[PDB]
Design a protein around this ligand. Structure first.
Ligand SMILES: NC(=O)[C@H]1CCCN(C(=O)Cc2ccnc(N)c2)C1
Ligand SMILES: [Zn+2]
Length: 139
């Protein structure tokens, strides 16, 4: 689990969104595994606006942050689960590293701020849903 709180927005993995998230839905994209809901309290997380390919992510299944190199956001094949059939998830970034299903929502960060959140994993590759292109999150 995990979310990004910026302004009056809460950004979570779509497969983990709550009833409250859906009742206060702002935007959702199944092809990106992202959902944004509105909040009453103001959030102060900083979204990175960059092309960084290095960062650090939080891995809850190890209580540790790991430094990784990751690919630029792109369309990648994702095997089916109880949340989705087999499909191509877009705006996804891969890195060599450990993850478990419960790690989804762990933040990936660079020197400029929040890059994205853990969304996919398996066979030693961890995938992050990018949020750096969502300029409206800051307005
Ligand atoms: N974005 C999706 O379609 C995900 C929905 C939930 C299932 N899924 C995963 O990759 C599960 C996962 C995540 C992280 N580490 C792992 N070792 C296994 C795909
Ligand atoms: Zn950066």
């Amino acid at each position: 689990s995990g979310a990004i709180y910026v302004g009056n927005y809460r950004v979570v993995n779509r497969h983990l969104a709550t009833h409250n998230d859906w009742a206060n839905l702002v935007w959702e994209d199944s092809s990106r595994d992202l959902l944004v809901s509105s909040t009453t309290a103001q959030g102060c997380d900083t979204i990175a606006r960059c092309d960084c390919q290095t960062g650090v992510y939080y891995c809850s299944s190890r209580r540790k942050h790991y430094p990784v190199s990751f690919s630029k956001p792109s369309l990648i094949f994702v095997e089916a689960s109880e949340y989705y059939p087999a499909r191509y998830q877009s705006h996804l970034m891969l890195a060599v590293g450990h993850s478990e299903p419960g790690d989804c929502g762990g933040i990936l960060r660079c020197q400029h701020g929040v890059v994205g959140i853990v969304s996919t994993g398996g066979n030693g590759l961890v995938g992050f849903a990018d949020v750096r292109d969502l300029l409206w999150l800051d307005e």
